[PDB]
């Protein structure tokens, strides 16, 4: 997160830290005691599928305390339409091997209904994005969880306000822009998979997933997020599914 603040311990309770082979992989968002939502691109280079860990209640990566809970990732579900190396359909649904225990420091973020998210949450101006990603474009990652407030843009405005870059990815209906084009604030590479949470009438909801951007906090550019509202039915159906033998599951979308 570039230009953000430290999220006070316990204030981003749904934030998940994904590790592969013990190393920092990506961010994630807890939506209930068993399920985590993350970004599909986080799993592009994975070889050791039985070595994925989700950590809840994390805050400072340099110190361990009694609020941290680790769980083995039993399943990683990705849309079969997603193409590694690209941007569209950048979502992953992960099943934890055993449920986490809900505490003052581990709370799930509400996965909203599609219509409510499209007609109400989509028009709430600001939302929070968080993670232990880079503090600067191509810079070092963060030790303490960082959070940033970003304003949402309708795609037409995003396109009209963005500096033209050749061969850039299309911003599809499965994405949305949020952020600033002045080079001051944005999420970044290691924040991928993390939440874009929206506060509405006293409750927080999952509206986006840190996905991609032209660099991080680059002038003439905004952060691009996976539009979670397009995936509500897909996510709900799969959460009702029975576990499979292998970890990765490429499930049909829609």
């Amino acid at each position: 997160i570039v230009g953000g603040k430290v999220c006070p311990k316990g204030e981003c309770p749904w934030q998940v830290l994904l590790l592969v082979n013990g190393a920092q992989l990506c961010g994630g968002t807890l939506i209930n005691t068993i399920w985590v939502v993350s970004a599909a691109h986080c799993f592009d280079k994975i070889k050791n599928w039985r070595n994925l860990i989700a950590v809840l209640g994390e805050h400072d990566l340099s110190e361990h305390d009694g609020d941290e809970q680790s769980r083995r990732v039993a399943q990683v579900i990705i849309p079969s339409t997603y193409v590694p190396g690209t941007t569209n359909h950048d979502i992953a649904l992960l099943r934890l091997h055993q449920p986490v225990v809900l505490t003052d420091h581990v709370v799930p973020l509400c996965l909203p209904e599609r219509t409510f998210s499209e007609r109400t949450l989509a028009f709430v101006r600001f939302s929070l994005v968080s993670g232990w990603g880079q503090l600067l474009d191509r810079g070092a990652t963060a030790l303490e969880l960082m959070v940033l407030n970003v304003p949402r843009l309708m795609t037409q405005d995003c396109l009209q306000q963005s500096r033209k870059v050749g061969d850039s990815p299309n911003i599809t209906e499965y994405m949305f822009c949020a952020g600033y084009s002045d080079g001051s604030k944005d999420s970044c590479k290691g924040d991928s998979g993390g939440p874009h949470a929206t506060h509405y009438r006293g409750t927080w909801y999952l509206t986006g997933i840190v996905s991609w951007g032209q660099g991080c906090a680059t002038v003439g550019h905004f952060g691009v997020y996976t539009r979670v509202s397009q995936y509500i039915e897909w996510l709900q159906k799969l959460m009702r599914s029975e576990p499979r033998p292998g970890v990765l599951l490429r499930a049909p979308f829609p």
Binding site: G10, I31, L111, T120, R201
Partner: protein
């Protein structure tokens, strides 16, 4: 207006223009200077756009040049106060007033619902936690 014996009476703005309807020249002869006359004529010739009573639902019309402005009672809006605010309780209007979920029901009233871990209150719009750690709440802050 002109009717012979009345025209013997000396020019008067009140009699010729206020009490009767006058022409630009009659007025011009009273004011003499063209700019004084046009200043008079602009509002005089403009007409009362409020005459047809455009403001509905107990609104109040205030005339302007070639226009009017309607002052509406609190339950109405629109140029002519035609919009009933009481008939706007739909989900696209500030979530139908629902705290969490809103459902439109045509032919009858909209209803509100809540996310799993919450239940709807007596007011028909508010949601209250039914579990210790409901989703979307930050325990250390409440």
């Amino acid at each position: 207006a002109n009717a012979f014996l009345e025209e013997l009476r000396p020019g008067s703005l009140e009699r010729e223009c206020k009490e009767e309807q006058c022409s630009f020249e009659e007025a011009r002869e009273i004011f003499k200077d063209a700019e004084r006359t046009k200043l008079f004529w602009i509002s005089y010739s403009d007409g009362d756009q409020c005459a047809s009573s455009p403001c509905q639902n107990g609104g109040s019309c205030k005339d302007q040049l070639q226009s009017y402005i309607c002052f509406c009672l609190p339950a109405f809006e629109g140029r002519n106060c035609e919009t009933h605010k009481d008939d706007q309780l739909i989900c696209v209007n500030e979530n139908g007033g629902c705290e969490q979920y809103c459902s439109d029901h045509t032919g009858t009233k909209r209803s509100c619902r809540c996310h799993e871990g919450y239940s709807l209150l007596a007011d028909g719009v508010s949601c209250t936690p039914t579990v210790e750690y409901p989703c979307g709440k930050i325990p250390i802050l409440e």
